[PDB]
Amino acid sequence: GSHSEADNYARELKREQEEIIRVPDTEAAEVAEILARYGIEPHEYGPVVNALRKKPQAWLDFMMKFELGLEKPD
Amino acid sequence: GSHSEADNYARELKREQEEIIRVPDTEAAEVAEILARYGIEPHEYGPVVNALRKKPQAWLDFMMKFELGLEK
Numbered sequence: 473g474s475h476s477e478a479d480n481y482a483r484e485l486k487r488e489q490e491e492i493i494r495v496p497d498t499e500a501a502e503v504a505e506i507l508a509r510y511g512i513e514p515h516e517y518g519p520v521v522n523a524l525r526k527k528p529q530a531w532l533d534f535m536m537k538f539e540l541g542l543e544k545p546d
Numbered sequence: 547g548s549h550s551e552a553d554n555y556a557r558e559l560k561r562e563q564e565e566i567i568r569v570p571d572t573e574a575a576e577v578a579e580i581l582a583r584y585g586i587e588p589h590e591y592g593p594v595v596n597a598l599r600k601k602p603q604a605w606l607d608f609m610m611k612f613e614l615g616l617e618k
């Protein structure tokens with residue numbers, strides 16, 4: 473039929489927040505991996521990671537876009 | 547006739563590259579504003595923006611993925 477389940481966004485949003493809460497250290501290295509793909513060095517991305525960790529809402533939206541390739545609608 | 551997925555990307559890769567050559571500082575601001583979107587402070591994102599300006603293909607890759615949302 474015509475579809476109305478919470479899409480992949482809604483489902484991924486849930487999963488991603490838990491990880492942040494439950495294994496923040498793992499989610500922080502994920503950001504390193506992502507930025508490191510583009511040649512960036514730890515001394516350059518260290519403070520970025522550090523900024524996101526102190527901002528649980530930002531960090532979630534960051535992971536959504538950078539790790540998972542999905543935009544917050546509106 | 548044909549529209550290769552390779553073609554649509556090489557067309558957009560061309561355009562954005564011609565932007566990095568013609569208006570590089572404007573493109574550096576594009577990265578800035580994308581990062582600042584996530585409450586990162588210019589002292590924090592500055593060096594990243596700098597890191598990219600020094601590796602133009604990475605900087606080009608970065609825009610392709612995160613500014614335009616395209617994949618290889």
Ligand code: NI
Nearest residue numbers: 473474475476
């Ligand atoms: Ni149906």
Ligand code: NI
Nearest residue numbers: 491498499502
């Ligand atoms: Ni994870």
Ligand code: NI
Nearest residue numbers: 513515516597
């Ligand atoms: Ni360095």
Ligand code: NI
Nearest residue numbers: 547548549550
């Ligand atoms: Ni045709």
Ligand code: NI
Nearest residue numbers: 565572573576
């Ligand atoms: Ni541009």
Ligand code: NI
Nearest residue numbers: 523587589590
């Ligand atoms: Ni600060």
Ligand SMILES: [Zn+2]
Nearest residue numbers: 473474475476
């Ligand atoms: Zn169906």
Ligand SMILES: [Zn+2]
Nearest residue numbers: 475476477479
């Ligand atoms: Zn569906």
Ligand SMILES: [Zn+2]
Nearest residue numbers: 483484487540
């Ligand atoms: Zn997933």
Ligand SMILES: [Zn+2]
Nearest residue numbers: 487488491539
């Ligand atoms: Zn995840």
Ligand SMILES: [Zn+2]
Nearest residue numbers: 499502535539
């Ligand atoms: Zn993650």
Ligand SMILES: [Zn+2]
Nearest residue numbers: 547548549550
């Ligand atoms: Zn046609």
Ligand SMILES: [Zn+2]
Nearest residue numbers: 561562565613
């Ligand atoms: Zn462009």
